[PDB]
Amino acid sequence: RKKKVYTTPKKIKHKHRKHKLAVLTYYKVDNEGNVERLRRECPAPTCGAGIFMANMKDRQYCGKCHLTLK
């Protein structure tokens, strides 16, 4: 019976931030060497090796188990 008119501008749902070959940045391969494991993989018992933190500012976050350090 009424025409719904909006006041706030239309919102856009968040889109997943694609990163091309993210796994390359987690490792530094040495010539005649081995894995680097440079991102400080999470130590929580839920997510073992291969699950890495996010070296963002003033904290290190891992998406599997939501916890932060320093």
The span from the CA of 42 to the CA of 63, in Å, is 10
39, interface contact from RNA, Zn ion, none, CB < 5-8 Å by kind: RNA
Given 37, 45, 53, 70, the residue binding RNA (CB under 7 A): 53
Question: Binding marks (x or -) toward RNA, 1..40, rule CB under 7 A?
Answer: xx-x-xxxxxxxxxxxxxxxxx--xx------------x-
Q: Which of helix, strand or coil describes residue 46?
A: coil
37-66: contacts with Zn ion (CB under 5 A): 42, 44, 47, 62, 64-65
66: left (phi over 0), alpha (psi -120 to 50) or beta: beta
